[PDB]
């Protein structure tokens, strides 16, 4: 019942300033300290600082007291993370997390990836990846979407909105040699369910307000 | 206060015991409670809490997982590894401010050797239209993670324009798999007949080969 929904993903500038968000709901806001976390590409989890949302008090690891700017807004039930003038060190996914006694940090909201670049948003181009005699393998099929194209990360890609899960293998970006990335989501299915069966890709790249729903047929 | 994890990355073959171990630069237990809990980070997911105060398990938790210690030693066992304990493991303590996390302890699972299945599409008709060709060859759920893929053009080895991918291990049955793309113009695309991956992996006793023949 606890929740913690954070704000998009997105690209800042050099030397601007970003402002997160973190919405609870499922108890009661003001009773819990709300931290924050910050976690680099491929690196391990740093702790940033803490507020306590009745008082408004605040601690920081050292590394960040200049940097982040916490605050809460109590009515609203949503804490707010400021970072200010953005450098490379500062790409990272960035947590909030509810402290349960201001010690364990029991709920996580999902992570805001805030990439710091002078580079411009670009959404993807999605097209299927249908399955046909040539992706056939021991009475199953494979099918997927190709998600090319686009800046910054993340895109996330779900089937069927959630309903398939099973066999999804959804790539980790590649870097193409312009910049942009791209990935593809495939999925195995039986062979005999292709003319039965309906398999919608659905793609989101926050950062760019992009949702595309791709239908793969059979080709 | 630092908290060093050991060791870096752990590799076990499914249902034998993992333990992880975390030291902390000073005492973190009083008489009645130890401030060290621990959390696991799946692929693409936050952080979940596993552990709270040594040894209590959070609620949904399963029951092979424990942990142990006091002090300044710590211990998170799982009894017997299964596929979707594959994560990273952090220790994090509460003793004081500032709490502060431990390096993490991947956990990697050793599971039987698997021949990847291959599939190969050849670019959309939609991608077409705009120019450009990407024909994708997919290598699915294979161990271990070693493979090789080349690409065929016309029985012509190519270099230069394709890029691969890997997965991390799945949450479900531990393989890994891989995808190639190889993009052309369409132009190019449309000079040639046979498109063609080879792989080769240790689970296989010679290379294996899908194509298809544009047109």
């Known amino acids: 019942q606890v929740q913690l929904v954070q704000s998009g993903a997105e690209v800042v500038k050099p030397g601007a300033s970003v402002k997160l968000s973190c919405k609870a709901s499922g108890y009661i806001f003001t009773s819990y300290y709300m931290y924050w976390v910050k976690q680099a590409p491929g690196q391990g989890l740093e702790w940033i600082g803490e507020?306590?949302?009745?008082?408004?008090?605040?601690n920081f690891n050292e590394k960040f007291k200049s940097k982040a700017t916490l605050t809460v807004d109590k009515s609203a039930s949503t804490a707010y993370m400021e970072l200010s003038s953005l450098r490379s060190e500062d790409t990272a996914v960035y947590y909030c997390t509810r402290s349960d006694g201001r010690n364990d940090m029991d709920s996580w909201g999902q992570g805001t990836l805030v990439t710091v670049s002078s580079a411009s948003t670009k959404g993807p181009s999605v097209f299927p990846l249908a399955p046909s005699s040539k992706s056939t393998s021991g009475g199953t099929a494979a099918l997927g979407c190709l998600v090319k194209d686009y800046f910054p990360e993340p895109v996330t890609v779900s089937w069927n909105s959630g309903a398939l899960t099973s066999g999804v293998h959804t790539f980790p970006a590649v870097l193409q040699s312009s910049g942009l990335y791209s990935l593809s989501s495939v999925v195995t299915v039986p062979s005999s369910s292709l003319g039965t069966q309906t398999y919608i890709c659905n793609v989101n790249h926050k950062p760019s307000n992009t949702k595309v729903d791709k239908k793969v047929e059979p080709k | 206060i630092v908290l060093t994890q050991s060791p870096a990355t752990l590799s076990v073959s499914p249902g034998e015991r993992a333990t992880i171990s975390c030291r902390a630069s000073?005492?973190?237990?009083?008489?009645?409670?130890?401030?060290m809990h621990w959390y696991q980070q799946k692929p693409g997911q936050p952080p979940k809490l596993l552990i709270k105060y040594a040894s209590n398990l959070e609620s949904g938790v399963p029951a092979r997982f424990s942990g142990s210690g006091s002090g300044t030693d710590f211990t998170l066992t799982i009894s017997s590894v299964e596929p979707e304990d594959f994560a990273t493991y952090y220790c994090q303590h509460s003793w004081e401010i500032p709490p502060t996390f431990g390096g993490g302890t991947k956990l990697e699972i050793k599971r039987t050797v698997a021949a990847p299945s291959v599939f190969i599409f050849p670019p959309s008709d939609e991608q077409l239209k705009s120019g450009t060709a990407s024909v994708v060859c997919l290598l699915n759920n294979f161990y271990p993670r070693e493979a090789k893929v080349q690409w065929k053009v016309d029985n012509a080895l190519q270099s230069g324009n394709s890029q691969e991918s890997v997965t991390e291990q799945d949450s479900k049955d531990s393989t890994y798999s891989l995808s190639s793309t190889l993009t052309l113009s369409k132009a190019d695309y449309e000079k040639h007949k046979v498109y063609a991956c080879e792989v080769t992996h240790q689970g296989l006793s010679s290379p294996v080969t899908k194509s298809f023949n544009r047109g």
């Open positions: 000073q005492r973190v237990s009083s008489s009645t409670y130890s401030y």
């Open positions: 507020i306590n949302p009745s008082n408004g008090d605040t």
